C-alpha cells in the first residue's frame, strides 16, 4: 500500500560523484526487496552483518541509502577495512556495519566516445577521515599546511577526474554504487 522509494534512488539519471555522495533516508513504508534480486543486472550485492534474505526480518527503523559512482578497479574499497585512495579519503565505511553494498556496470550511460570528465574523486587530503564523514570543500592542498595557489611550487589541487571512455577495459569503466545501512537500534517499526 505504501512502497518505499527504492524506485527513485536506484533508477536515477545522475548519480553524484564519490567526493560528494548523497543520502536519502527511507522510513514508514513497506520495502519490496524483490526487484533487486536480479543476478545478471547487478554485480556485487555483498552484505555484512545480515544475510541476503531480508524480506522476512523487518530491520526497519531507518535505512540510509548512500549512492555514488566509482571506477571499476576500486569498487572493492566500498567495504569495511580496505585502506585505499577511495575509501580513506572519500567514503569510509565503519568496521562494524549492518550495511548492504550494491553495484552495477554502467558503460552504456556514464561513459561516452569522446570522454566523460564530469565525475570526480578526491585523492589527496590531510589524513584519513572517520566513518561516514564526507568532505565537499575544494581548497588547494599544500604539504606544509600553509596555503598555496597552484601551479606554484609542489602543491596541487585535491581532486581528479575519472576520465571515462567507451574504448577502455573493464577496470576503468564506471560502476554505479548504492550502499544501504540498516540501523535497527530498538525503535518502533
Amino acid at each position, epitope marked *: 500500500t505504501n512502497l518505499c522509494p527504492f524506485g527513485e534512488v536506484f533508477n536515477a539519471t545522475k548519480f553524484p560523484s564519490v567526493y560528494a555522495w548523497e*543520502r536519502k*533516508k527511507i*522510513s514508514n513504508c513497506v520495502a519490496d526487496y524483490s526487484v533487486l534480486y536480479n543476478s545478471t543486472f547487478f554485480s556485487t550485492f555483498k552484505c555484512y552483518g545480515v544475510s541476503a534474505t531480508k524480506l522476512n526480518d523487518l530491520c526497519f527503523s*531507518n535505512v540510509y541509502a548512500d549512492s555514488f559512482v566509482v571506477k571499476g578497479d576500486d569498487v572493492r574499497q566500498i567495504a569495511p577495512g580496505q585502506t585505499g585512495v577511495i575509501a580513506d579519503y572519500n567514503y569510509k565505511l*565503519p568496521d562494524d556495519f549492518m550495511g548492504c553494498v550494491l553495484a552495477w556496470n554502467t558503460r552504456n550511460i556514464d561513459a561516452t566516445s569522446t570522454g566523460n570528465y564530469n565525475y570526480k574523486y578526491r585523492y589527496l587530503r590531510h589524513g584519513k577521515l572517520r*566513518p*561516514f564523514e564526507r568532505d565537499i570543500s575544494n581548497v588547494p592542498f599544500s604539504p606544509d599546511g600553509k596555503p598555496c595557489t597552484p601551479p606554484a611550487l609542489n602543491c596541487y589541487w585535491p581532486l581528479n577526474d575519472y576520465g571515462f571512455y567507451t574504448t577502455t577495459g573493464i577496470g576503468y569503466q564506471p560502476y554505479r554504487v548504492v550502499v544501504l545501512s540498516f540501523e535497527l537500534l530498538n525503535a518502533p517499526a
Partner: antibody
Amino acid sequence: QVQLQQSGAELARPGASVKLSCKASGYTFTFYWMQWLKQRPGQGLEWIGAIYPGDGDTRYTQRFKDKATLTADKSSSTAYIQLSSLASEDSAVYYCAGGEYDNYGFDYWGQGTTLTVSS
Amino acid sequence: DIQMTQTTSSLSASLGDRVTISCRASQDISNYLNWYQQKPDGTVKLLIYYTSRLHSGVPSRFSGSGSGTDYSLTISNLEQEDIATYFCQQGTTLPYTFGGGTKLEIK
C-alpha cells in the same frame, strides 16, 4: 573544522516557552542526526531527543515527550527545541550535540546554554 | 531504560601517576561504550568512541579498555591540563544514557 555555535544565556518566566537554537556549520547538516542533552547542576547528562533535519523525523524519550518539541530548518542549518510548560525544575544547562556515525559517539558538541525561570 | 552507575563521584590523584575511572552497566551493552570529557569551562569533547582504545584526535595517555559489562578508562601519566569530569555513555540501545561523572582534583 566543525563547530556548533549555540545561543547565549537566557532568562524566562514560569508557564512560558523558550525557543533555543543550535547553529551547525562546517559539515553537511541534512545527512546526520542532532541530539539534545540537558544537564542538571551537578548531575549526569540526560537524552532529551534527537532530530534528523533531512525531513524533520524526531525521536523523543519517555520523560520529555510533552515538554520539548523539536523542529529544524534546512537552509538556515539550525535546529530548534522549544521547551513548553516550564516549571521551576527546568533551570539547567542544555547541550546540543551530533555526529556522523552515532554508534561511534557524538563528536561535535555545543558550548552549552543555560536557562532560568524566575520573576 | 538502561542505567549506568559511576559509583565513585569524585577522585583525588597526583600528577604523573596512573589513575583509573570505573563505570558499570545494568545489562550487557555489547561493547558500545564511549568516554566523554567535560572541562570546567563548559566545553565537552570525545576521547574514545569504541570501548577498546579507538581514539579520535587525542594524546595517547588515555587508553581505555574493558569488555562485557564492566569498563574503565585510564590515564598513564597525568598532566595538569586534563583535570575534568569524565562521562561514560551507553550507545547500544535508544534511549541513550550517561553516567554521573567523576570530578578530578590534585592531591
